Design a protein around this ligand. Structure first.
Ligand SMILES: CCC[C@@H](C)[C@H]1CC[C@H]2[C@@H]3[C@H](O)C[C@@H]4C[C@H](O)CC[C@]4(C)[C@H]3C[C@H](O)[C@]12C
Ligand SMILES: [Mg+2]
Ligand SMILES: [Zn+2]
Ligand SMILES: [Zn+2]
Lengths: 49, 215, 146, 83, 146, 109, 48
DNA sequence: AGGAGAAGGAGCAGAGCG
DNA sequence: CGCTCTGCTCCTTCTCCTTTCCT
């Protein structure tokens, strides 16, 4: 039962978040060049490493 | 009722204090003893001898401080005007607008009590040079700025906004936006195109600075 | 040298698809949480929904949710007449909770409705209302209804 | 549009994973379409592996143009960026 | 008659006093009366929070709503045992509230700043979006990944 | 009021008739009742309320096992509450959720 | 350097004013924690 | 289903009138 | 002073959208 809801949730999450990229000035922006975050997480640190 | 009267007076005193500090941090001169008034002093100085409050002893005026006028040269005096009639109509609002224009203020807030009519709201944005800022009274009991969830918003001048834009090579249409008629935006009295600096603190990153623009 | 190298290394590199990375890092754990508020039996605490329905409400920004809870921080610490005196100011329709009966009375020319609001219950549940608060509430309800 | 000068460049001097993968792919394409190489081949036929060898020996003749959001850019070569 | 509030807030179901792990005695309210509770006497108004991010947005502002979103997500995904980096949730909150108001992750919210008829049609309500773009002469640029 | 007309049992009403009389009308058959010399009334008893009690919680009498918290170096947890109430697929085994009885850290296995 | 909100230089008494915060603050905190850890080791040695 | 969105009604304090 | 406009505020009816696909 929960599979369908989880899949739909993941798809719409991706639709909302799909185009956000760290830039060479370190800001997180949109496709339209709208600056949503000035530094990633207020830190600029990649959570992976 | 006696306890109902006591509760009304307590709420009125707290609202008076909130308005006092709101006018303070906006950049107008009030003093720490002026804001840190005791409840007994409030009752003895702003109430009649019958045993009721009187809103008309409280309508006061503020003036720009030296540093505030140095930073924002085009800032005039305001006029806080508490009201006694519960449901404000066009008569009281028209009288208020005439008083504002005859006293030639640059701004002036209006702390109504119970309700504001849709017709009175239509006279609020009708003055070419100046503007009025209608405020409820049930809203002002606890100031928003002192809540734990509200980061310290700071207003930027024209020079500082230009400095921010030049640093990131940005355009004002691209900064994140703060709605006009936002509880913290109207607290500071934000006009369109004003940049507000925010100091938000995260446990995973300490303190970092973000920015917004009034929209 | 070790610490400086590691810190200079850990930085989000330009070009990262951080939006999609975060979207998948939130959605992927979301596929394992049950569509139910499972909890350990034997507690019977307050009912709050904290599964994928809760994530769905937060994500959807729904104007009406189920089980909304306000956390009010008090000033004192005393069970008797320190917490109840401030709980009594945030509660629901107590007219039938303090009425203790209601009467319908007719006469030669007048038609009555009588309520005998006992004061012992108010004396127990520490409430700030005696006579005229009830009367003003009833008149406000009459304006609201008839 | 203009180019940020060599004396003042504000971008990181560490090559990124995306820059590395793009450099390797472009050089592999160039080699697979019969371009001269600059390392001792030993015994190898794959353009990808030849490009990897050239990158390890730091002999790839390409530069990277980094585009800032405003629209200016900086030029970094492969013998400058480090990993 | 016996169904009209005589004291308290006619927007709140019930309140219960809770015994905290520190020994403190605080009560948490189940309803929608936030501003009234913050204003009631006997409670600390600067320390009072609710579940509803939209409620926090109306009374406290947009930054407070962003904090509320981040905390609520961290709680809902921390009580289930899912270990997610806080920065992903930070980015989710910033995106959800980066245009001055709480815009959800639905199709109605997605008309926030996307301004892209192609990706809106790719997502949902395809024909409505394409016909609206034809009428209003929507002139999008091809920059998004979709 | 809930009273019924004798000999037709239909219903009794109070009528705004002539000469200001609130007599007990019927509307089904010719039956009348003079209220004069009044004793009529309707008594409805009402349970008032009880003094409600707190909801601290009873982590006692909850399932307990013997495991180690992930953050052992901070809090020393040798027990944990659990439930075996998550089953993804039938071929795949069950899943057990825990919470640190010491600190209160939820995780699953 | 921690310049001012308009581009000036802070006067070294207004360094932690919660209004001149910027980026590089997390980097400063990292350096401070580094120095603190080394100082912990040094103090333990001196105490022994 | 549920679940929001949106377009049309329907009663209602408001405000101006001779 | 009821009358009569102008305008909310509330409410009911009416469609959209729901998971990996697996060749
Ligand atoms: C008991 C049922 C009442 C319910 C229908 C009412 C009572 C209080 C109302 C909320 C508050 O006004 C605060 C917010 C204001 C925003 O603008 C829209 C959302 C917001 C949460 C409201 C939604 C809705 O209107 C609520 C839940
Ligand atoms: Mg299997
Ligand atoms: Zn009969
Ligand atoms: Zn533990």
């Amino acid at each position: 039962v929960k599979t369908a809801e989880t899949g739909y949730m993941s798809r719409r999450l991706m639709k909302s978040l799909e185009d956000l990229s760290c830039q060479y000035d370190n800001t997180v922006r949109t496709s339209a060049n709208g600056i949503v975050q000035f530094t990633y997480g207020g830190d600029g640190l990649d959570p992976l490493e | 009722m006696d306890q109902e009267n006591e509760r009304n007076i307590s709420r009125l005193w707290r609202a008076f204090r909130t308005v006092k500090e709101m006018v303070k941090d906006r950049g107008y001169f009030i003093t720490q003893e002026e804001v840190e008034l005791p409840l007994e002093d409030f009752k003895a100085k702003y109430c009649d001898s019958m045993g009721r409050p009187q809103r008309k002893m409280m309508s006061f005026q503020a003036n720009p401080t030296e540093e505030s006028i140095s930073k924002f040269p085009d800032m005039g005096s305001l006029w806080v005007e508490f009201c006694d009639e519960p449901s404000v109509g066009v008569k009281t609002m028209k009288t208020f607008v005439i008083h504002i224009q005859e006293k030639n203020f640059q701004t002036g807030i209006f702390v109504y009590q119970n309700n504001i009519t849709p017709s009175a709201m239509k006279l609020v944005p009708s003055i070419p040079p100046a503007t009025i800022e209608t405020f409820n009274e049930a809203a002002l009991v606890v100031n928003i700025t002192h809540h734990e969830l509200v980061p310290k918003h700071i207003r930027l001048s024209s020079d500082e906004k230009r400095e921010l834009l030049k640093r990131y090579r940005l355009k004002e249409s691209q900064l994140p936006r703060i709605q006009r008629a936002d509880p913290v935006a109207l607290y500071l009295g934000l006009k369109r195109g004003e940049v507000v600096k925010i100091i938000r603190k995260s446990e995973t990153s300490g303190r970092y600075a973000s920015y917004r623009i009034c929209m | 040298e070790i610490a400086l190298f590691k810190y200079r290394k850990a930085r989000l590199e330009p070009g990262t698809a951080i939006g999609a990375i975060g979207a998948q890092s939130i959605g992927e754990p979301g596929t394992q949480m049950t569509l139910k508020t499972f909890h350990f039996a034997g507690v019977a605490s307050m009912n709050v929904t904290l599964g994928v329905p809760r994530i769905k409400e937060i994500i959807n920004a729904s104007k009406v949710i189920s089980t909304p809870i306000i956390n009010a921080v008090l000033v004192n610490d005393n069970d008797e007449r320190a917490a109840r005196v401030v709980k009594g100011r945030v509660e629901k329709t107590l007219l039938s909770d303090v009425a203790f009966y209601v009467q319908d009375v007719y006469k030669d020319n007048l038609s009555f409705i009588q309520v005998r609001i006992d004061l012992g219950t108010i004396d127990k549940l520490q409430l700030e209302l005696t006579i005229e608060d009830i009367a003003v509430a009833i008149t406000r309800a009459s304006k609201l209804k008839i | 549009e203009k180019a940020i000068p060599k004396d003042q460049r504000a971008t990181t001097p560490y090559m990124t994973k995306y820059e590395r993968a793009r450099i390797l792919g472009t050089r592999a394409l160039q080699i697979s379409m019969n371009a001269p190489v600059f390392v001792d081949l030993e015994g190898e036929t794959d353009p990808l592996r030849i490009a990897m060898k050239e990158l390890a020996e730091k002999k790839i003749p390409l530069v990277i143009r980094r585009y800032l959001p405003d629209g200016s850019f900086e030029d970094w070569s492969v013998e400058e960026l480090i990993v | 008659l016996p169904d009209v509030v005589v004291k308290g807030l006619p927007d709140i179901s019930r309140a219960v006093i809770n015994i905290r792990d520190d020994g403190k005695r605080e009560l948490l309210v189940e309803g929608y009366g936030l501003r009234d509770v913050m204003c009631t006497d006997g409670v600390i108004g600067s320390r009072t929070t609710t579940n509803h991010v939209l409620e926090v947005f109306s009374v406290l502002g947009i930054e407070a709503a962003r904090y509320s979103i981040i905390r609520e997500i961290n709680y809902t995904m921390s009580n289930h045992g899912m270990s997610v980096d806080p920065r992903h949730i930070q980015l989710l909150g910033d995106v959800m509230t980066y245009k001055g108001e709480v815009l959800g992750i639905t199709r109605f919210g997605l008309s926030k700043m996307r301004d892209s008829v192609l990706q809106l049609a790719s997502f949902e309500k395809t024909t409505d979006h394409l016909f609206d773009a034809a009428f209003y002469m929507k002139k999008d640029a091809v920059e998004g990944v979709s | 009021m809930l009273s019924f007309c004798p000999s037709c049992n239909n219903m009794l009403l109070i009528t705004s008739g002539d000469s200001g009389v609130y007599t007990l009308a019927c509307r089904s058959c010719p039956y009348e009742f003079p209220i004069e010399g009044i004793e009529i009334y309707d008594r409805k008893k009402l349970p008032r309320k009880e003094v409600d009690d707190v909801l601290g919680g009873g982590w006692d009498n909850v399932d307990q096992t013997k495991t180690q918290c992930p953050n052992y170096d901070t809090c020393g947890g040798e027990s944990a509450y659990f439930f075996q109430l998550q089953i993804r697929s039938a071929d795949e085994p069950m899943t057990t959720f825990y919470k640190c009885v010491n600190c209160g850290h939820r995780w699953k296995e | 350097v921690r310049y001012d909100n308009s581009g000036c230089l802070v006067k070294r008494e207004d360094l932690n004013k919660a209004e001149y915060v910027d980026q590089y603050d997390a980097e400063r905190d990292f350096y401070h924690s580094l120095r603190e850890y080394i100082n912990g080791k040094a103090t333990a040695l001196a105490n022994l």
